[PDB]
Amino acid sequence: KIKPKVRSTVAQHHEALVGHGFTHAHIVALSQHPAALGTVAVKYQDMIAALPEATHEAIVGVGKQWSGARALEALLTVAGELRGPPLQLDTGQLLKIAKRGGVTAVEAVHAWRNALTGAPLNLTPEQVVAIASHDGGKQALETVQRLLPVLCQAHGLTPEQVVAIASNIGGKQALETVQRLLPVLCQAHGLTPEQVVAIASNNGGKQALETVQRLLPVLCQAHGLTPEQVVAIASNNGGKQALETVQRLLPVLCQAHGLTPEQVVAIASNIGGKQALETVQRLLPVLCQAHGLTPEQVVAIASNGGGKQALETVQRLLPVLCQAHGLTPEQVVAIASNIGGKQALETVQRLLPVLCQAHGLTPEQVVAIASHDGGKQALETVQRLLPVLCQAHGLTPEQVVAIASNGGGKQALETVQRLLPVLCQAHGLTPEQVVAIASHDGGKQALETVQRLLPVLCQAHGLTPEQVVAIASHDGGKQALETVQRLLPVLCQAHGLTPEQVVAIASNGGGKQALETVQRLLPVLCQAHGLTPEQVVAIASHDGGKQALETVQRLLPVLCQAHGLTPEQVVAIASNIGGKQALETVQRLLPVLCQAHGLTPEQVVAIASNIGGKQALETVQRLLPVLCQAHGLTPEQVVAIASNGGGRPALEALHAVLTDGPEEAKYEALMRLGGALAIRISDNSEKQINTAINLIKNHAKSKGVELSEEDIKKVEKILKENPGVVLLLTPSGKIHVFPSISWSLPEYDGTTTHGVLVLDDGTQIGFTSGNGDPRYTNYRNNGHVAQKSALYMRENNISNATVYHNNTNGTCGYCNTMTATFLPEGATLTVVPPENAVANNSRAIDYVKTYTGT
DNA sequence: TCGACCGGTAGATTGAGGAGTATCCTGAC
DNA sequence: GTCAGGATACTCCTCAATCTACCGGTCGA
Ligand SMILES: [Zn+2]
Structure with a gap:
């Protein structure tokens, strides 16, 4: 040189x-x-x-x-x-x-x-x-x-x-x-x-x-x-x-290679956009044909700074990291879908046989270290510092891998090495707290700021080391710590807040933003719009609380005057992670759902008042007509399955199971929803068929739905032609017919218990645990199979029956005698556990037992 | 001591995507 | 000597899903 x-x-x-x-x-x-x-x-x-x-x-x-x-x-x-x-x-x-x-x-x-x-x-x-x-x-x-x-x-x-x-x-x-x-x-x-x-x-x-x-x-x-x-x-x-290049490569990439214009714009909106676009034009057929990638994978590889190098390196090194080092194409694309993915991918190729053998790591841990914007530096620093940290400071190797699996990675790890003997000896912390502070995006800054500010916030402002560590243990805890030091004298002495509320606001992702926004908006939201400081703090004490709190400012009168919502309902929608999205989606979709889909404002608010209540509301809008018309689910069941945290994946999984899952999966999913009657008969005799139809009619009239005589004839024909067929009557009235499930109870899966109730005529009824009687929710055996059988016997005129279940743990202790409360006078119910039932606790019964009435 | 085949509420933890900030190297003239 | 383009590294803010912990009424032991 x-x-x-x-x-x-x-x-x-x-x-x-x-x-x-x-x-x-x-x-x-x-x-x-x-x-x-x-x-x-x-x-x-x-x-x-x-x-x-x-x-x-x-x-x-x-x-x-x-x-x-x-x-x-x-x-x-x-x-x-x-x-x-x-x-x-x-x-x-x-x-x-x-x-x-x-x-x-x-x-x-x-x-x-x-x-x-x-x-x-x-x-x-x-x-x-x-x-x-x-x-x-x-x-x-x-x-x-x-x-x-x-x-x-x-x-x-x-x-x-x-x-x-x-x-x-x-x-x-x-x-x-x-x-x-x-x-x-x-x-x-x-x-x-x-x-x-x-x-x-x-x-x-x-x-x-x-x-x-x-x-x-x-x-x-x-x-x-x-x-x-x-x-x-x-x-x-x-x-x-x-x-x-977007002027000339937009017609081509959107016509020949079939890329969406937003994909081309996402590729081009990066430092080396022209080079990435040209190399995508060159390397899309080759990568999607010979190396088995999909166009979305190539677009995700190229939608990053200096993505030409990453794309060319994937083309060069995909037949090697998939054949020699054992990584799958998804893992290679995950490694390369970052800033400087060429360096990370080459470094993985170089060091994967060294880290996974000499230092005891595993390929998943190495890939998780490398799958970040600085993966090469993180991997090299881990190889350098694993012998040092793991014995001269005590950090277990999973702690080092957790520190380094972040955007900083090398910086946070070197800072931890430099600062463990200080924070753990003078400032009075413990290594777990240091590794919790450092395991974030920019934990070097958080560690240095904690070292600089812990003696100050603990004496001048009256905080404690636990509160300072909780403030600092987030992405950008340097900013939150500095703004807390700056604003705690003001917030806690002018607006009337307390250090607990300020620490709760700051102990979040964008805590600096939320804290400044609370300072700016608290003398407004509680003066004009009518809120109280507790409601504002509850809105702000979440990730992205600035966005949610500004959105509340903007949409409190619109929501409370156009759609009739109360201020409490708006605050309850907003008091969640992503409340801006939930509020905007509620504004957009409350009329559509309330009028076209036959919902109520309370059901929409209930769906929206959850983490991810924008996805769980668009999903309901998209999937309600399909589920309530083809699969027979009432709108109440859809609302109750969507009114849960993460209720978009649950609703999608229910739809998938109902549309293409096996018949047993459909049967279990439909039972796990609500008041459905799963009847089955033993022979083709007239008396048994009449008994089954009688039970079906009583169950239908219990839900207030009238069965047409054509449906009655169809059910009679099904029972008179198919031996062993299962008739599952959903609450809406639809009668699913399952021709072949089994003649034996399913294997116990640890979560849902099944059970079959047999009367004196051979008729069999299906029950599963959960979804107890809403009027008996105070009892400790609400939703147990034995109580369900007891209540079914009570509702009808049945005085002798045998319920078999499949829970290997045996009958509950709560059902020891409270099941006899639900049977009518003289009624006899016989619980039978499986053959291999063993008492897993101090009160379980694992043998055939008989209960009477009172 | 003796019991949930329950459910509701509150905090916590894991994962992903977007955006902004910072530094260094190459080539052209 | 200044300017334009490209690659790589680090720090901060927002949204979504899952996990974990606790608690209650009512009945023989
Ligand atoms: Zn029980």
């Missing part, structure tokens, strides 16, 4: 460089700019004087750039002044400016340290060191000091927005083109100034703006793309290229 033009000087200067502390690798890295090789070797002892505590890595980084020697010579005679009154610069910021900005940027910051920080601009030192530390920062600084008043006054741009526009490589061009294109992009094409500033704050913002001005009246009026999609495509490095 040494050029022939450089060797004749590196050989001469190696003798001088060695002895100051420079290794040969540092010499090779620094030899990119030959002029530095002398300048360091003659002045090193001086520079460490001008820049105390600047390691050799920093010196190499500064001196190896395009103007490293000049940058170091400038920092030699400029670092004295920038550490003075105007800017409070230290060594780190000086090296940050000189490494990236260069000698020109250092000189510019030196000469203009007064005007930039002075009154007319009011730039903080951080903003100056962020504008200056970029490739060509002197031009950006001059352009800012020339154009800040104009943008901040004439165009209404915040100084933070202008600094974010200038804090990029093409900062000068971006500023000088925003200043001339804001009147046009925000008046003719209808973009908000925030959209233009989001477009322009990128490495090529001038090109992106200049090409959006042309491709808004083309990619919208012809290709059918919304302005939000265009301004999300263009808001990335080199967005001009992404737009120019």
Whole structure:
């Protein structure tokens, strides 16, 4: 890595460089700019004087750039002044400016340290060191000091927005083109100034703006793309290229390869969008044909930053990680569907036989480590630090794998290694608490913040270490901890909250957002809309509480005046994870469900008042006509199966079982719903058929549904032609006919008990546990098979019957004598457990038993 | 001590998808 | 010397599903 033009000087200067502390690798890295090789070797002892505590890595980084020697010579005679009154610069910021900005940027910051920080601009030192530390920062600084008043006054741009526009490589061009294109992009094409500033704050913002001005009246009026999609495509490095290829590769990818336009937009709205689109066009048939992938898998691989490399690497390495290392294609696609998936996938190929053998891991654990945006670094750090953490700190290997299976991964793991002997000895924590803080996205920041703030929040604010650890043990606990330290004196002393409520609000995902929103909205929601602080805190004490609380502000009068809901019902809908979605969906769907589908507002509120109440409501809208017309389920049963947490998957599974499952699965699913009568006869005699039809008629009239004589004749024919057929009468009236289930009870599955009740004529009735009588819910044997048989005997005129069940644990203890309460006078009920019944507890009965009445 | 083949409510924990922030390297002129 | 495009790593916020823990009325032991 040494050029022939450089060797004749590196050989001469190696003798001088060695002895100051420079290794040969540092010499090779620094030899990119030959002029530095002398300048360091003659002045090193001086520079460490001008820049105390600047390691050799920093010196190499500064001196190896395009103007490293000049940058170091400038920092030699400029670092004295920038550490003075105007800017409070230290060594780190000086090296940050000189490494990236260069000698020109250092000189510019030196000469203009007064005007930039002075009154007319009011730039903080951080903003100056962020504008200056970029490739060509002197031009950006001059352009800012020339154009800040104009943008901040004439165009209404915040100084933070202008600094974010200038804090990029093409900062000068971006500023000088925003200043001339804001009147046009925000008046003719209808973009908000925030959209233009989001477009322009990128490495090529001038090109992106200049090409959006042309491709808004083309990619919208012809290709059918919304302005939000265009301004999300263009808001990335080199967005001009992404737009120019979406202009020509949208007809092809949406016609030949059959990609949805939203899929193409999702592919293109990334840093290297053009390259990803071109390589998808090249590699879609090959990957979907030879390597067995589906188009959705390829789109999910390519919808990521630098997805061309990930896609090509999958093409190259899929026949190897599936044939030699044993990973399945789903796992390879999961590894590669991330940022820098090429590196993760190559590192898995390299290290999977090493981590899984020398360190005791398993392929699933390695794949779970690698399936993140920094999987290569996490895997390498795990291989480095498993011998160290697991014995010098006690962390069990699953704890290390849980720490590293996150987006940070390497950072959190190194920080844990550095900070376990501190937090566990001085601040009084335990390793479990540290591993709980660190097992999140950005746990290095959380750990450092806890170390810095635990002595403060525990004395000045009155909290406790458990509360601080609960606040910190989330994604972005640094922000929640800082905002708690900032706002607890205000929230707990002005609005009337208490530290318990503030800690409950903060102990969530976006706790900083929810806490600031509560500060902003509590003097409003409890003054105009009529809520109370307890209701607002309950709305806010969830993930995304800012969204839910703002949505409540927006939709309390609309919901409470257009649809007749009470404030309590709106608050109950909102007091859940995802309450914004639930509230918006309730607004959208309350009339449709209430009128077209024959529901009530209370049923819609009950469906929506659950975690995932938007999915559970759209699913009900989609599936109610199918279930209540073909399968005979009443709307009440659908409402009660959807009014549960996670009630979309349950309803979908019920539909799948009813549509294509085996007959026994349909039978059990239909019994597990409600008041259905599952009758079966023994022979074809007239008396038995009449008894079965009589029982069916009584059950039907118990539910208030009248059976037509045609249905009676059909049932009679079915019973008179099919021996062993099962008639299952659902509450709505539909009579399912199962021709062949079994003649024996199903195997016990540990959850639902089955049972068959036999009368004196051979008629058999089916029962399962659960769904007890609502008027006997106080009893401890409500929903047990024996109680169900007792109540069935009580309702009709049956005085001698035998119920067989299949629970291997035997008869309950509660049914020991409370079952005799439900039988009428003189009634005889014989419970029979299975052959292998054993008493699993102190009171179970596992033998044939007889109960009488009272 | 003696019992749920129950259900309802509250907090907790696991997983996924989206968006924003930050740094470094290559090529062109 | 500045500018444009591409790849990789880390931190923060929102939504959905599942899991776990606790508790009650009423009857012989
Ligand atoms: Zn029982």
